[PDB]
Amino acid sequence: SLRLDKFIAENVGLTRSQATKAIRQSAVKINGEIVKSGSVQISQEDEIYFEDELLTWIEEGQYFMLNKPQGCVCSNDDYPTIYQFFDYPLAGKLHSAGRLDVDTTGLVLLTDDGQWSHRITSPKHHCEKTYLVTLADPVEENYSAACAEGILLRGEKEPTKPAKLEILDDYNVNLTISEGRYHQVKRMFAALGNKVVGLHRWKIGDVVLDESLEEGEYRPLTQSEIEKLV
């Protein structure tokens, strides 16, 4: 067996200090339990989680893009999960690099590489995520400026970071955000007096969801896509 902090540092690509801080911030679990000590000994009989993503003991280097349908979640284990779209043992070696809510559709990246996935979801790297947002009511003239300036939402201590809004038509826009607060997009438009009736992610960084993928289908990423994301 080996130390939890050594495992987290090496598998998530963090310094021992960063791994220690993550552990202190309740970001690390052993078999579903929050663990606050980096000295705890672990083995392959243990399932290790970082920000709720299951890390594999046998990393090989696998990367995929999935077109997620509604009605399923991005957890390894109420609703079915995205792992139903993969066969075992492959399904058991993967975790996600940015989850999508149960009814949000689109681009979900799956990988067995914890260093790669963390770089993608790390706030510091502020990776851009673009969503096709369909609204119940017509877009208003103040939307673009509000998104660019930032919106102070109830339940938040800070306003949303500047986001880029692109109007497609009166009921559809593309919104690019470099963060992912709880139900952020839904809350942003609700704050503006509208309602999100459709949410589809089609881009992360410079990687676009393969439009030939039906919902539930996935394909391996190309080396170019893998490299562009980090």
Place this chain on the structure above:
Amino acid sequence: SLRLDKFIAENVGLTRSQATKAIRQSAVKINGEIVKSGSVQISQEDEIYFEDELLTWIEEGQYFMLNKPQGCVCSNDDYPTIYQFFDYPLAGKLHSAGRLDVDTTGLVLLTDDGQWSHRITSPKHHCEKTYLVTLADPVEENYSAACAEGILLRGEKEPTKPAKLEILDDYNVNLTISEGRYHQVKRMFAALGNKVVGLHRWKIGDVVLDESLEEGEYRPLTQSEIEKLV
């Protein structure tokens, strides 16, 4: 008349900088519409909202505690509101010091004092709120430690601040939090693998909900209670 930013600063008790930021961040409305220009002139007849709480220009000093029932919301706007329990014009000169979701019951403080209410709900402050929480599945031994040491919720950059959990029985607990993150209580228990099926607030600071109040009933706060929340 006066500038929207002067009104917000004086009424909510913010610095001119904070007021300017809140307005630019779409947290302020004039007669139900978001206004991002602090220079806009307003009269006593205009209805000003800060994060959807209706403020009062000429404060008289009213403070009440209401026992909120399920099926109603805390706002002036799908369901009936808690202001239905008040007669006009009083109902139109009050706002809350901490809102509860539609099916959450219990203690809601109503007032026309923007500074008093702001301090109670301000993220910069740490006013304690205690809830009787009923869960779908049995509570677990480690719940207390988890709440005391912090839980990292999806959508958050930092773990929840220290909270106090008291187990009452197999499906009920009292949880005291000094934070106000979006749907925090529900998300905390969801993170622990459970589900809140019942939620009743009975204490804010050292002020306890009057047990003699039937749902829908309210009473004025005593001077002692008003001061305890100062």
